Amino acid sequence: SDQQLDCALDLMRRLPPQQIEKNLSDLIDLVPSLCEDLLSSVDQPLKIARDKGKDYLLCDYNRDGDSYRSPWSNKYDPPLGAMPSARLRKLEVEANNAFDQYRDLYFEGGVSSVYLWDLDHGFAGVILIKKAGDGSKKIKGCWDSIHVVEVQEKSSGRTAHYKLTSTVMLWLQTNKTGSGTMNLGGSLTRQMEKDETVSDSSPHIANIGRLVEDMENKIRSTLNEIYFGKTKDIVNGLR
């Protein structure tokens, strides 16, 4: 079914991007063979859970079984589990506290979550940021960003190699008198590969955050052009 999954992914790229949850569920009920292969390949909106006391975001890299581990309490909400090493868990808390400020400085709200896992010659992490514009009938929107970084140490540890892969899902809806209902939905994916020095004045998190910030500033610029420029010109070309 290698050509079956191809048509399944080609279908999700063409369907209305604000119905991925039900389409992917209908798509799995249609062909349950690729149930696991699709979920690990289809970009889905980030889901929110409660630590029970901040919110935290759910993904596959912080999941073990049918339970989800909180980045604050370090315990799975469905009690168990795969835990980070004591040295990595300490670096993970610094990462959550660093990207919690990054979330506030650039989004002024929303939820953020960082999860790390040890590989072999380094560690890899996921940065999850979720910003929703609720509480208004006329103006709505949401922003989901998923960053996966791979850190590779080089000998003495003065320089390391980083590999970044980011996806930003953007939705907007307006209900105005003149333009009626306008709905914009979609996403954008970028990859990165670079190495920077690792001194005491610039640790790993200072390098990872410096690459997430520059990436999201680049993605935002492209999103502003394809959302409010490219699609605008296509509309004016229809009339």
């Binding site: 048509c7 790229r13 063409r14 369907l15 209305p16 119905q19 389409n23 798509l27 009920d29 249609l30 610094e94 660093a98 400020q101 400085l105 650039y106 989004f107 002024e108 910003k131 514009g133 929107g141 949401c142 922003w143 953007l170 907007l172 307006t174 105005k176 003149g178 333009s179 009626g180 209902t181 306008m182 709905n183 914009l184 939905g185 979609g186 954008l188 994916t189 004045s201 610039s202 640790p203 998190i205 200072a206 955050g209 410096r210 910030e213 999201e216 935002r220 492209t222 999103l223 502003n224 394809i226 409010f228 490219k230 699609t231 605008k232 296509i234 509309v235 004016n236 229809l238 009339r239």
Partner: protein
């Protein structure tokens, strides 16, 4: 289950982007893997997509393209071309027309509104098509104007389509107007983004003669579809400097990038 796999397959075909029906049909065919379940189960879905998208079709020897709409459905697999009073077979899969045959009470107003609408569509749309219907709905005389305009450029990785449906319910001396305008754009050159926009319109107009009411109908269509397009461009700008910023800013409030070792 096997009544549920065609229900899922029909829904996927219903929500195909303009100009991407063929690519969605293949993905659905290779996924369902039951070509006879797809042809008789999702037959209504192929007809539903074409009728909802106002698909223009070229009939041999009749030059003017006609839109496939629910108002043109004659209830026997055929569709009506009110301009050249004929009916024809339409194959919703190949999008082909065949078997033409000739095809009442509100015929003069339809001819008038059509003549006025064709010049309007030519003055405002590049590759635009239109079709005006005259019929009775629940004992009420109704005039239905439909407009379609699309640009299919898969080589440039984008497609778009404009749709307009204007319903004028004649109740002398008035006519209740109910309209819907629809735009759908898919752009996948870099990234992937889809626009879905609609607007509902309710208005009133006093009827007179078949000609004075026709030009008064087109006037309402012209003023409303001008405001719709202009307000969309003004809203695009608002979403650029405001609604997007309310999600994520370009720079922090301090207007300087983050000092990352001042956080740790």
């Amino acid at each position: 289950s096997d009544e549920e796999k065609v229900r899922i397959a029909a829904k996927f075909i219903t929500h195909a982007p303009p100009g991407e029906f063929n690519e969605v049909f293949n993905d659905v065919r290779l996924l369902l893997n039951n070509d006879n379940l797809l042809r008789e189960g999702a037959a209504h879905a192929f007809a539903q997509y074409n009728m909802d998208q106002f698909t223009p079709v070229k009939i041999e020897g009749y030059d003017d393209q006609v839109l496939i709409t629910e108002h043109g459905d004659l209830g026997n697999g055929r569709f009506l071309d009110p301009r050249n009073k004929i009916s024809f077979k339409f194959d919703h899969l190949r999008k082909e027309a065949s078997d033409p045959q000739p095809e009442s009470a509100l015929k003069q107003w339809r001819d008038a509104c059509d003549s006025a609408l064709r010049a309007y569509v030519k003055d405002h749309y590049p590759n635009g098509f239109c079709t005006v219907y005259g019929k009775s709905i629940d004992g009420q005389q109704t005039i239905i104007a439909c407009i379609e305009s699309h640009q299919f450029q898969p080589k440039n990785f984008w497609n778009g389509r404009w749709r307009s449906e204007w319903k004028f319910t004649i109740t002398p001396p008035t006519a209740q107007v109910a309209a819907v305008l629809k735009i759908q754009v898919h752009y996948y050159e870099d990234g992937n983004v889809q626009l879905v926009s609609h607007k509902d319109i309710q208005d009133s107009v006093q009827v007179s003669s078949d000609v004075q009411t026709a030009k008064e109908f087109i006037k309402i269509i012209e003023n409303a579809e001008n405001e719709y397009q202009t307000a969309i461009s003004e809203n695009y700008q608002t979403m650029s400097d405001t609604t997007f910023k309310a999600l994520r800013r370009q720079l922090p409030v301090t207007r300087t990038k983050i000092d990352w070792n001042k956080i740790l």
